[PDB]
Amino acid sequence: TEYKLVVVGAGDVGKSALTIQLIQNHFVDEYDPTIEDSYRKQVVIDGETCLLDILDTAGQEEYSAMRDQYMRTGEGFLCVFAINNTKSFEDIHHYREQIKRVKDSEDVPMVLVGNKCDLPSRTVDTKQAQDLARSYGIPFIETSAKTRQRVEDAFYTLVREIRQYRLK
Amino acid sequence: TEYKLVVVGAGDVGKSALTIQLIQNHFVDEYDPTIEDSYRKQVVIDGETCLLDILDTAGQEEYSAMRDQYMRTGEGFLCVFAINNTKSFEDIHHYREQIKRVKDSEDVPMVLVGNKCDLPSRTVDTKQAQDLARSYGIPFIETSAKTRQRVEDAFYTLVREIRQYRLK
Ligand SMILES: Nc1nc2c(ncn2[C@@H]2O[C@H](COP(=O)(O)OP(=O)(O)O)[C@@H](O)[C@H]2O)c(=O)[nH]1
Ligand SMILES: Nc1nc2c(ncn2[C@@H]2O[C@H](COP(=O)(O)OP(=O)(O)O)[C@@H](O)[C@H]2O)c(=O)[nH]1
């Protein structure tokens, strides 16, 4: 029943930073007497219980067996690039296309995120990213994990996209 | 075709340390003109191409949707405890039992690893661990990522267990 969110994108774009900040602000301790220690942590976003996973394909993950499994399991995807890393923006399309193939679906809940919007060394313009999101039919949000701008907004937006998809 | 190895165990036992050390010693750059950049890194152990994944269930992973997927995908498991952490040893049985349920199999290639054997603050005796491995019918090896003792031996042993299982 939980909303299954997957954060995906190139290395070093801030996927871990964004996810850690989200957890810090949204984790709760839940009483559950059907488990050994009687309490478990969960993340609740916009009234919805959420599971969170990060899909990397670089570094250690260039050796993983699990890429396609993450894409099959995930329900909605936060597609992250960094606004000072043109290659990370170019890499978005590959991840989206892979997700659609693995899920065998034209309709998958996604949000495009341009992270590191605090930085002055921008090489990806807001309009380039807007154009990409418009083509996909999805929201685009600029965020900063460093300055804590729109981090919550990005995850809330994805939760809404999943909720809408579940109504279809 | 690749051998799919999963490293599993409690938090802080040295799963990342062991895996990083293995990769450092066994990664190769492979020529493959069917991919964009023409080269990809792979890990080769005992002549076998291997994929590597780490299954954690604590910390960030207490929020994951992926536990059972790791267990279904993995072919052989390196079940790690630390010899200065009695709880991590007690936790092994739960992981093994979960793996067997998810895989719906009584026969799964595994190796039991007691890591941190460099430490003088031992609370898990070699004989306790030997007894557990004997019950399961699997090898037991003590390792140290810090002093680089038997790290390669642990992964080679698991590769042999998988190879034997593939012959059945
Ligand atoms: N300036 C800035 N740095 C960030 C931001 N988010 C992450 N970083 C830094 O970018 C690097 C990569 O972040 P990380 O979370 O490890 O990225 P991942 O590899 O995508 O998980 C780290 O040094 C972070 O501190 C951000 O919004 N602004
Ligand atoms: N003394 C000692 N420390 C180790 C050894 N392996 C890992 N560590 C330390 O134990 C801690 C946890 O290791 P880590 O690889 O992060 O464990 P994981 O959470 O199971 O992936 C870190 O501080 C490591 O440096 C070992 O063989 N000996």
As a dihedral over the C-alpha atoms of residue B38, residue B41, residue B47, residue B50, rounded to 10 degrees, the angle is -120
At CB < 8 A and 24+ separation, what contacts does B160-163 make?
A: B160/B46, B161/B76, B161/B109, B161/B110, B161/B111, B162/B3, B162/B5, B162/B48, B162/B75, B162/B76, B162/B109, B163/B3, B163/B48
- Give the C-alpha separation, A24 to A1, whole Å: 23
Task: Please report which ligand is nearest the Cα atom of B7.
Answer: 2
One DSSP character per residue, A141-157 reads EE-BTTTTBSHHHHHHH
Residue type at position A96: R
Neighbour-count burial of A97, counting CB atoms closer than 10 A to its CB (0-12 exposed, 13-18 middle, 19+ buried): exposed
Residue whose CA is closest, atom 7 of ligand 2?
Answer: B14
Helices (H), B11-120: 15-26, 67-73, 86-90, 92-103
B73 → closest Cβ in A52, A53, A65 = A65
Nearest CA in chain B to A44: B63
How many Å apart are CA A18 and CA A92, to the nearest integer? 17
- Strand ranges of the sheet holding A48-55, from the earlier edge strand across to the other edge: A27-31, A39-45, A48-55, A3-8, A76-82, A110-115, A140-142
Closest CB to B66: pick one of A2, A62, A73: A73
CB of residue A150 inside a 6 A radius of ligand 1: no
Q: What is the DSSP letter of A119?
A: -
Residue A113 near ligand 1, beta carbon < 6 Å: no
Method: X-ray
Give the type of residue at B168.
Answer: K
* Nearest Cα residue to A84 out of A114, A56, A113: A114
Whether the CB of A57 is below 8 Å from some CB of chain B: the reply is no
Say if residues B74 and B7 touch (Cβ distance below 8 Å): no
List chain B domain ranges.
3-167
- How many A from CA of A154 to the centre of ligand 1? 16
Instruction: Test B63 with A41 for CB contact under 8 angstroms.
Output: yes
Q: Is B107 on the interface with A (CB under 8 A)?
A: no
Resolution (angstroms) equals 1.4
- The whole-angstrom separation of Cα A159 and Cα B61 is 20
Mark yes or no for CB contact A69/B65 under 8 Å: no
Topology of the domain comprising A3-167? Rossmann fold (3.40.50)
Q: Encoding tokens for residue A137?
A: 């039919």
Q: Give the span between the Cα atoms of A78 and A15, in whole angstroms.
A: 9
- Helix segments in B4-85, DSSP class H: 15-26, 67-73
Mutate to test the pocket of ligand 2, among B7, B8, B13, B20 (most ligand atoms within 8 A of CB): B13
By Cβ distance, the residue of A23, A63, A72 closest to B43 is A63
Q: Whose CA is nearest to atom 19 of ligand 1?
A: A12
Name all contacts of B11-16 with Cβ < 8 Å and 24+ positions apart: B11/B56, B11/B58, B11/B59, B12/B82, B12/B85, B12/B88, B13/B80, B13/B81, B13/B82, B13/B85, B13/B88, B13/B115, B13/B116, B14/B80, B14/B82, B14/B115, B14/B116, B14/B145, B15/B54, B15/B56, B15/B80, B16/B54
Ligand 2 atom at shortest distance from the alpha carbon of B147:
27
